[PDB]
């Protein structure tokens, strides 16, 4: 019986195996793919790193405890320091990616709680100072360390998850590709996202595509014992990496 709860993902030279998972999501119903001749405008033979880049990378885990506000990662920024992908990002003048985003969170039958995992394109952030203040580059491109909504700042973006980070309400964030992790049912969530942009290819350093939000909706509790602490781990891979134009390594 090929239960829908059990999946294996093989990508490049890495695999993910799950036993308690919900059906994976293909954002907007479109599987990731390469740029067509019709869409293309950049007159350069492209580079396709293939399986040297299109493999799973794992980001440092974070602890989910009572009082946690949630976390935010930017793509492709989060992977800028990882593997050949991270290096290619600074040599190629432009490129395009799709992603497989996998969020993990283990628990027992005695635990309760719920994470909301959402992928938001072009998630332009509000500044902590409001007014005419823009969020500085340094605070929108943290790499592997995501934006911890639990941390105080005055120069960073606003951190209150009710309003996401842009003035919309979290209740309506479900319009975006999303999946929930209920500790009682599933320990993983998987979202596959095609390249989404107004242009064929774009900078991979001055602009983010996708903003991965992981926001707890229901705090972690347990039937008994002290406040629980459950790690949350995020694993991300490029799908159809396609790059163009060679330059000296970009300096940020």
């Amino acid at each position: 019986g090929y239960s829908d709860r059990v999946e294996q993902i093989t990508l490049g030279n890495s695999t993910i195996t799950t036993q308690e998972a919900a059906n994976s999501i293909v954002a907007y119903g479109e599987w990731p793919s390469f740029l067509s001749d019709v869409d293309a405008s950049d007159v350069n033979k492209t580079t396709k790193p293939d399986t040297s880049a299109c493999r799973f990378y794992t980001l440092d885990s974070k602890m989910w405890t009572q009082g946690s506000k949630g976390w935010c990662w930017k793509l492709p920024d989060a992977l800028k320091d990882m593997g050949i992908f991270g290096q290619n990002m600074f040599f190629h003048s432009q490129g395009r990616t799709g992603y497989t985003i996998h969020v993990q969170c283990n628990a027992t039958k005695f635990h309760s709680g719920c994470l909301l995992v959402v992928v938001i394109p072009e998630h332009q952030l509000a500044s902590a100072e409001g007014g005419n203040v823009s969020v500085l580059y340094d605070k929108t491109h943290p790499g592997e360390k995501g934006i911890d909504l639990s941390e105080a700042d005055s120069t960073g973006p606003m951190k209150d998850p009710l309003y996401m980070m842009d003035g919309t309400l979290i209740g309506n964030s479900l319009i975006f590709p999303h999946q929930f992790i209920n500790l009682r049912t599933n320990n993983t969530a998987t979202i596959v996202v095609p390249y989404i942009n107004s242009v064929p290819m774009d900078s991979m350093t001055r602009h983010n595509n996708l903003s991965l939000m992981v926001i707890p909706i229901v705090d972690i509790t347990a039937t008994s014992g002290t406040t629980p602490s459950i790690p949350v781990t995020i694993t991300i891979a490029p799908m159809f990496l396609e790059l163009s134009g060679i330059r000296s390594k970009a300096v940020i």
């Binding site: 239960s3 829908d4 709860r5 919900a22 059906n23 994976s24 999501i25 293909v26 954002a27 907007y28 119903g29 319009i175 590709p177 049912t185 599933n186 596959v192």
Partner: protein, 40 residues
Amino acid sequence: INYYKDAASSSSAGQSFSMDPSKFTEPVKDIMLKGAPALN
């Protein structure tokens, strides 16, 4: 009748299209069926 040969000048012509909510309501790899377990 169009009176201008610059297409932007055209009035807001168009047809109604069948809706396709599946892009926003059922973006899943494995097809779910009504009445079937969601969690197999």
